[PDB]
Motif scaffolding. Structure first.
Motif: not given
Ligand SMILES: NC(=[NH2+])c1cccc(/C=N/N/C(N)=[NH+]/N=C/c2cccc(C(N)=[NH2+])c2)c1
Lengths: 186, 186
Positions: B90-92, B117-120
């Motif tokens: 929500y606050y990312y 590879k990421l979603e996995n």
């Molecule tokens: N409060 C926190 N510490 C906090 C809050 C929300 C998210 C995260 C970290 N997120 N990291 C993310 N979302 N990484 N996403 C990477 C990624 C890479 C490739 C594809 C996708 C995808 N959603 N298809 C995501 C950390």
């Protein structure tokens, strides 16, 4: 038609590209039309888009009416609504464009109102399935509105974030989902 | 480090201005690097973004690692992990650029390799929860990998498509879902 040729091109560009991506510049010229041709029907781009969501929403619930007959129990109605979501051509192919729109435009009045009931129509299909199911005694949900919203969203997730793989694998997961969900309600 | 600076600066640019608007030229000059160096490390903005995303993933994991100790039983880890996914996103700030990026490359198969590879990696979290849940008689799942892709995408959908209303209610629904889903597994 013309106003319907716009709705047509737009829908095409809103699915392929995002909401912010495609601009009223493209829609126009791509329909061999002119800019000043948008007012009483499509003045603003958000109006145009919100209109398409309304259409596709109609087409989809219309199609579900003509196809929900194949299922006798509502438990089956649940399975069939989800499986179908994966194969339709309505509303769901627009979920990506919708997510941008919901964020980018969250500071206007045409968000928490204009397209407010657009979601109630989307959770509606489940609203009936769960209610009618309580009458037809297949389960007992004391909080239908929730479960409805939950099922609607859960499903949309499976449909939207797997759009890149063996369509028949999606169907299997979606049926595996419905089994789990329903087995959790009862 | 010149590489790590490029990623950090780029992470900031994408956040402040979104994905599409951010140029590799900007990144180059603000991280005091070069087209040459940037090309050598990521080849494209597409990839640069994927690497940032991979790093954000690791961090999410290191974070989840420390956090899960609050959950003795896996049933608890399921609830917690889902709730964290909803509240934290929500606050990312990077989320907007992710939406924009995703609905701009889910049609171009090239950016579908690393993209998965990421979603996995995200699904692993559930896989571990479920497997370990078996070795504790918390539940019996013989198709873990399946149930995992399902929970991941369903949860993801609840987080992304509910975006509208008071945060407390959202968390309420996300917990409701975790309850039902875990009940349909028994
Ligand atoms: N409060 C926190 N510490 C906090 C809050 C929300 C998210 C995260 C970290 N997120 N990291 C993310 N979302 N990484 N996403 C990477 C990624 C890479 C490739 C594809 C996708 C995808 N959603 N298809 C995501 C950390």
């Amino acid at each position: 038609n013309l106003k319907d040729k716009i709705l047509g091109v737009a829908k095409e560009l809103f699915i392929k590209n995002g909401y912010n991506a495609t601009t009223t510049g493209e829609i126009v010229k791509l329909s061999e039309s002119s800019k000043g041709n948008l007012y009483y029907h499509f003045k603003t781009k958000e109006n145009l888009f919100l209109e398409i969501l309304n259409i596709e929403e109609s087409k989809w619930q219309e199609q579900w009416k003509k196809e929900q007959i194949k299922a006798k129990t509502n438990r089956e109605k649940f399975y069939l609504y989800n499986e179908l979501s994966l194969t339709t051509e309505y509303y769901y192919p627009l979920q990506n464009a919708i997510i941008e729109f919901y964020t980018e435009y969250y500071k206007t009045n045409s968000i928490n109102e204009k397209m407010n009931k657009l979601e109630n129509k989307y959770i509606d299909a489940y609203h009936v399935i769960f209610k009618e199911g309580n009458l037809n005694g297949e389960w007992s949900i004391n909080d239908v509105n929730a479960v409805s919203k939950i099922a609607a969203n859960a499903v949309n997730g499976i449909v939207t974030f797997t759009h890149e793989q063996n369509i028949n694998e999606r169907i299997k997961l979606m049926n595996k989902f419905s089994q789990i969900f329903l087995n959790g309600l009862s």
